[PDB]
Amino acid sequence: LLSMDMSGIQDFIYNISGSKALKSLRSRSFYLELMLEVIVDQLLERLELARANLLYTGGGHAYLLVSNTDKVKKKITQFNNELKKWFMSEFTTDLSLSMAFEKCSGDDLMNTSGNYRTIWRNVSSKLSDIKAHKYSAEDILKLNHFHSYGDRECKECLRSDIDINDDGLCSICEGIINISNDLRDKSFFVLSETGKLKMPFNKFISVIDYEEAEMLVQNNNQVRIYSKNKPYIGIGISTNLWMCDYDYASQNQDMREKGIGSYVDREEGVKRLGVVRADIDNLGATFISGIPEKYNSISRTATLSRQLSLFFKYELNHLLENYQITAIYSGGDDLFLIGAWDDIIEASIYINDKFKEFTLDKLTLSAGVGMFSGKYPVSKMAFWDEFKKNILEEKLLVLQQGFSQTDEHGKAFIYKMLALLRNNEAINIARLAYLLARSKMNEDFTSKIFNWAQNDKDKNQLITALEYYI
Amino acid sequence: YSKIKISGTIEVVTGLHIGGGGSPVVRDLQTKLPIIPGSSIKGKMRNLLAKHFDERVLRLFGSSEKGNIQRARLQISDAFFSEKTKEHFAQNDIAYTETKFENTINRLTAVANPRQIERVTRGSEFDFVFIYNVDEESQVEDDFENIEKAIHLLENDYLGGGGTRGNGRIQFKDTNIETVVGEYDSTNLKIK
Amino acid sequence: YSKIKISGTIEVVTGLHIGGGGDSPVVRDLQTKLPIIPGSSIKGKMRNLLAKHFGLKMKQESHNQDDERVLRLFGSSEKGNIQRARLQISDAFFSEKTKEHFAQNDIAYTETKFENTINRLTAVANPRQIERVTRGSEFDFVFIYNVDEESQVEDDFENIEKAIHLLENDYLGGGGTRGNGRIQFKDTNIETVVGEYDSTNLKIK
Amino acid sequence: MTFAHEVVKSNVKNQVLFNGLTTSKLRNLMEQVNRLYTIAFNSNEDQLNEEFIDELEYLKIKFYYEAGREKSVDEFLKKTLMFPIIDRVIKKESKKFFLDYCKYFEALVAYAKYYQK
Amino acid sequence: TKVFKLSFKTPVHFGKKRLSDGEMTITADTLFSALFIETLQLGKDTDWLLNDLIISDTFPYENELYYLPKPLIKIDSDNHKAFKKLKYVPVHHYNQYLNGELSAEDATDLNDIFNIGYFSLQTKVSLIAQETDSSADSEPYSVGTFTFEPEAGLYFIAKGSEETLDHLNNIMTALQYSGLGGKRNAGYGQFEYEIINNQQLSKLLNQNGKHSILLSTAMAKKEEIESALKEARYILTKRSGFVQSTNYSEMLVKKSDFYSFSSGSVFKNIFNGDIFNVGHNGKHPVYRYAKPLWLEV
Numbered sequence A: 001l002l003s004m005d006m007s008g009i010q011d012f013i014y015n016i017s018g019s020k021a022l023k024s025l026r027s028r029s030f031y032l033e034l035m036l037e038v039i040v041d042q043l044l045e046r047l048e049l050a051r052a053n054l055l056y057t058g059g060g061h062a063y064l065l066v067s068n069t070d071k072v073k074k075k076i077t078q079f080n081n082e083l084k085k086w087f088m089s090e091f092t093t094d095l096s097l098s099m100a101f102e103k104c105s106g107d108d109l110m111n112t113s114g115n116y117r118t119i120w121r122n123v124s125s126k127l128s129d130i131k132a133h134k135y136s137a138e139d140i141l142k143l144n145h146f147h148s149y150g151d152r153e154c155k156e157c158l159r160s161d162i163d164i165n166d167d168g169l170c171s172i173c174e175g176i177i178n179i180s181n182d183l184r185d186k187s188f189f190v191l192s193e194t195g196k197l198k199m200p201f202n203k204f205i206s207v208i209d210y211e212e213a214e215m216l217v218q219n220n221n222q223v224r225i226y227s228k229n230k231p232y233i234g235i236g237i238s239t240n241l242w243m244c245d246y247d248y249a250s251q252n253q254d255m256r257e258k259g260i261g262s263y264v265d266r267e268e269g270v271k272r273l274g275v276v277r278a279d280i281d282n283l284g285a286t287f288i289s290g291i292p293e294k295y296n297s298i299s300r301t302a303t304l305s306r307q308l309s310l311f312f313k314y315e316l317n318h319l320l321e322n323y324q325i326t327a328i329y330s331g332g333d334d335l336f337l338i339g340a341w342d343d344i345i346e347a348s349i350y351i352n353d354k355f356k357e358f359t360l361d362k363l364t365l366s367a368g369v370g371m372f373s374g375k376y377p378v379s380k381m382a383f384w385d386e387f388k389k390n391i392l393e394e395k396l397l398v399l400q401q402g403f404s405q406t407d408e409h410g411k412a413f414i415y416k417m418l419a420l421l422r423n424n425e426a427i428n429i430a431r432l433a434y435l436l437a438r439s440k441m442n443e444d445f446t447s448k449i450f451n452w453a454q455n456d457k458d459k460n461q462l463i464t465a466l467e468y469y470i
Numbered sequence B: 001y002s003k004i005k006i007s008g009t010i011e012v013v014t015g016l017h018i019g020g021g022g023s024p025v026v027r028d029l030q031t032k033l034p035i036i037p038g039s040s041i042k043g044k045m046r047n048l049l050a051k052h053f054d055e056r057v058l059r060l061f062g063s064s065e066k067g068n069i070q071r072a073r074l075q076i077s078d079a080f081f082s083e084k085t086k087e088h089f090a091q092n093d094i095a096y097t098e099t100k101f102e103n104t105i106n107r108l109t110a111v112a113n114p115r116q117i118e119r120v121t122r123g124s125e126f127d128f129v130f131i132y133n134v135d136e137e138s139q140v141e142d143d144f145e146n147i148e149k150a151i152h153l154l155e156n157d158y159l160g161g162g163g164t165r166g167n168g169r170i171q172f173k174d175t176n177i178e179t180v181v182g183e184y185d186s187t188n189l190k191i192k
Numbered sequence C: 001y002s003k004i005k006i007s008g009t010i011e012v013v014t015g016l017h018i019g020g021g022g023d024s025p026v027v028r029d030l031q032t033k034l035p036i037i038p039g040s041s042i043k044g045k046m047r048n049l050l051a052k053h054f055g056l057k058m059k060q061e062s063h064n065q066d067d068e069r070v071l072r073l074f075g076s077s078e079k080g081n082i083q084r085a086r087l088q089i090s091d092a093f094f095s096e097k098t099k100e101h102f103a104q105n106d107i108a109y110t111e112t113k114f115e116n117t118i119n120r121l122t123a124v125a126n127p128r129q130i131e132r133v134t135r136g137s138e139f140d141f142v143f144i145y146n147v148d149e150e151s152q153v154e155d156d157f158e159n160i161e162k163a164i165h166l167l168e169n170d171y172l173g174g175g176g177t178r179g180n181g182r183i184q185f186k187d188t189n190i191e192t193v194v195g196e197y198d199s200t201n202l203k204i205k
Numbered sequence D: 001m002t003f004a005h006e007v008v009k010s011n012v013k014n015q016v017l018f019n020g021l022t023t024s025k026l027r028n029l030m031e032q033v034n035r036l037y038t039i040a041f042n043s044n045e046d047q048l049n050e051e052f053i054d055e056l057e058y059l060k061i062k063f064y065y066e067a068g069r070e071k072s073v074d075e076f077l078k079k080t081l082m083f084p085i086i087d088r089v090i091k092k093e094s095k096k097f098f099l100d101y102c103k104y105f106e107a108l109v110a111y112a113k114y115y116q117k
Numbered sequence E: 001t002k003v004f005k006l007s008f009k010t011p012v013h014f015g016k017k018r019l020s021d022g023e024m025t026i027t028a029d030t031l032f033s034a035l036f037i038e039t040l041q042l043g044k045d046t047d048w049l050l051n052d053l054i055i056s057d058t059f060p061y062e063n064e065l066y067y068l069p070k071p072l073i074k075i076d077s078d079n080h081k082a083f084k085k086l087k088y089v090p091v092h093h094y095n096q097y098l099n100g101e102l103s104a105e106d107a108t109d110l111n112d113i114f115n116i117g118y119f120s121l122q123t124k125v126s127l128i129a130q131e132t133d134s135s136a137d138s139e140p141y142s143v144g145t146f147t148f149e150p151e152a153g154l155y156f157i158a159k160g161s162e163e164t165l166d167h168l169n170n171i172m173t174a175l176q177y178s179g180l181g182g183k184r185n186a187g188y189g190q191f192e193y194e195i196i197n198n199q200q201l202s203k204l205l206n207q208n209g210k211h212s213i214l215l216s217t218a219m220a221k222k223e224e225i226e227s228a229l230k231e232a233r234y235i236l237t238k239r240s241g242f243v244q245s246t247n248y249s250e251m252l253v254k255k256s257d258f259y260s261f262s263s264g265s266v267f268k269n270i271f272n273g274d275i276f277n278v279g280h281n282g283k284h285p286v287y288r289y290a291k292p293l294w295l296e297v
């Protein structure tokens, strides 16, 4: 049982500060995903083995069930060595990969005495402690002695070791820009020896359409077409790669990808941006513990993993269709959406409910949403029932109806409301009583608002809702 | 070698609006008491002094970008409310920060769209410290004359935003000059 | 490089009602509980009147561009040929001598004269009470003028004199057409506070 | 403190308000309190002025005289206990508590205004 | 062997890659660099304070409690979640942790109580461009700063002969008025220091064990690294950046990239570091501090 872990995704994906940031992020998550996919496929080619042997992929992980042969082990070790060489050559700290495997027998897989979970934890532990020792002696000496003439940090990509070129961009990030430009229009990605973007095994990735992909097939070229969630392709080495690539900015009159301002410039509220991050809280046990004592088979673990992958890689794309939001990092257990402040919140709640349906209220979501001004480095942009029923549905609707029916009460009146509410003093409460007496709303609105302000939980909900209003 | 400390207090003759958030004003995200970033002080002094004349302004603040490199000789530090003002306002029950309302007139239309701005209360006192690093003996008198000129211009100008609109006028009081490292006499130096 | 300071006092000929707080109170310093004249109001009225004096066209009405002299004196920095403002207006505070007079004679700082509203076809009245600084009170103001250039000084001070002269026959505050907020200027002083430019030949009435 | 609200609800009898009290019967009343409101809001220190003490005495003068004119005014001024609170304000010499009384009376006025024929 | 207490009272920017990044502690490289530049500015000699002095990294403290970095020891459980979220272990519980006596709920409580500061971004502009004269965009930029509660700060570990310690104390007296971070001249990073002795920290620093906990950022010299990595749990950290007054062009001078072990690595074979040279095409040598400060348990 062989397991692979990608070292530095959360750092390398979040060194983005440029104006084209959104284009790169879609290109960067896809770049890491395609790295993992091509490396796993290349491994399976080394093993002369089938694609069915890949149990799970996603995030920076991968799980394989390969033959327990000395030949297999020597090939794994050799390919690990070449792999580590290559990553040291290209990024040297930002991205690294780890290999680990631990023996298992048929009796183990058939779920005899829960030893499936024991071996799962053992392989996890060996993977997680081999990361401690990543560099041999000679490698670490080799790194420290290069008085090599090089240029300075890539603007889009924070890296000293990298060397910039035209317009202060290095090769890697310029290729990232190009493939990002091609992402929205073209659906197929090819593994070719000339290509655009540098890739592990002396290979390059470029973009294709079904027709020239077809010609490549009849060109009997050693190609692997990687698709954008397209079934019924039947083109050469069909690879329906699972990925959620959604962007509302392409729904406008211009098909070309636009910058972060396309979402900032919304006039329905403050010109800001919304960001959401989500992780399944009960996932470690779910893959490890699973269904206890009766269904912890390798078959059912595979089924569970695939169903989670399909949810986090298809359903989100269809759910997002009604929101001004763009999908950035999706897959594994991580969900990253960026867009308008209101749309981000509404989509977060809606996707939370939909997920509770898909897992039948067995798995939950932990999420956090913040507000930041436009064109802030997206790198630093990134570093339930009560909120829906009480705040968004009841108090927010009451306040919206009241403010829509009575005019002249803008952000100044609500901000005086805020000054009285945040400073939790009885003098502010009496002042608020007078202010609601002076306000020209229906008496029901005033009474409800005052009585909400009189309760700490209800005053906090009220301030949250009215802050959402502005 | 020696170091010279310039310490004192500054008053807002009229309200001050640095407004990094903007319409808020800069605060500390926990104490919520407003401050004055040293970047504002440094930038306004540098602009005024340069526009008062390029070797001396290069010498005080240091550019170190034009193929020749000069280390900064005068370090500005941030400011905070004096304890005296906090005590005084707490005793007299005075809000720390005001909120003035404003408008603007559309020509051919004469319909006013409102405006809200947040302003530091008049009469507050901030505490400031300057550190000067004497690296050339024969230059301290000229440098302090220049810094006095900069203070003089700043007293007759504004800090922050909307200065032409009537805010940001400041004043300097209770300034002392104390040597803290080394053995340079700092009793013949003045800043008003 | 020099700077010219303009000082004086603004006497309320009749009730002034700035009243930026919105009953219907008046702006007050929170250090002394007193009504003030914000400098931006003064500067805006000077801007509007001086612009209306010179050319003010339809296409000029559209954009808040204005005559080159007015823009030069008050600064635009909006499109292309930007001009940093040469003239800085400051706020006005309720002076100390009027403190002494209203303390010695026990005079209120703000009247509350009631007004009404007789709508037609019903003739039903509707009452209201507003606050306005008492007559005769004085406020102290200060101006600072920058000389970015040498020769133009005379023309800029001529335009400043014109602006003051127009403003003395107009209103600050609100309800000006309804009687409130007339002022006059007096006791003006012109002195070069920083620099080496003489100012003995310069006068603003 | 809203006990004023409670008493006003207890004073809606089978309808009449304080048995013949109208808000315009209160004209001189709120005029006096508002006039004092201005003169006090001008002040700086919480230690009351002593012509302000005289003015509070004059306010109590207006209270008994209004009570003398009308029976409904007498009932209003007695039950809702203007009179001890004025006495203790006179005894205390505190400005903030004076404004507290001011918003008290204004609360009475507003609630009664919404509580009418 | 004394410790040096640091209280700040002003926001400090410490930096990893750009100015708008904020970081809580600083490594021995920048600490030794600051000491060396302060020494040179003061004009005293550097030989004494070059090859005798051992400096540990800066670590945070709270009201009365001190902190140390999390050892990278293999605790054999399986949560592996609450402990991964832990970054600093209070000194009172250090030996408890190294003996596997820390419970999950206690770890959660420690994580809850560990508030010792918060992060902020202040936006700044630069009108030095044509803006002053002609229509030109003001250029906004941001800096990442980090502030402490009034009863917090950072502390040191220093050791050496008494004469070197006296020199260090003199230099710190000088240094409390320069900065210790990023935009020193823009209003950030002034501190007051105080010398304290702690009985518990002393006992911890003079214990006796079989393992070793690295408290600084070091790299073994060429001939000893081979034996150094016999049984090691470590993580490497890339350290780069420009240099101050080495040639005409600051934007053409950039220190050579260097790699060193982090501040929590565990070793089995003690090695001695060195002040590696990271210069080339320069007029004066540029130094980087890589010398360990062990605690034996």
Ligand SMILES: Nc1ncnc2c1ncn2[C@@H]1O[C@H](COP(=O)(O)OP(=O)(O)OP(=O)(O)O)[C@@H](O)[C@H]1O
Binding pocket: A005, A006, A007, A008, A009, A010, A011, A013, A028, A029, A030, A031, A032, A033, A058, A059, A060, A061, A329, A331, A332, A333, A334
């Ligand atoms: N291509 C990607 N783009 C963006 N985020 C990704 C990508 N792949 C995975 N992630 C998310 O980023 C998270 C953080 O990755 P991180 O650098 O911590 O490595 P990891 O795979 O979690 O393993 P480890 O931290 O043990 O090395 C992952 O757990 C995953 O959810």
Ligand SMILES: Nc1ncnc2c1ncn2[C@@H]1O[C@H](COP(=O)(O)OP(=O)(O)OP(=O)(O)O)[C@@H](O)[C@H]1O
Binding pocket: A056, A058, A059, A061, A279, A280, A281, A282, A283, A284, A287, A304, A305, A306, A308, A309, A332, A333, A366, E081
């Ligand atoms: N579809 C999937 N199939 C199999 N394994 C997955 C899948 N998605 C995520 N995982 C794995 O489950 C593990 C969960 O660990 P992680 O720390 O990322 O989340 P977590 O432990 O649930 O965090 P928290 O408990 O704080 O929410 C990851 O290491 C990841 O490899």
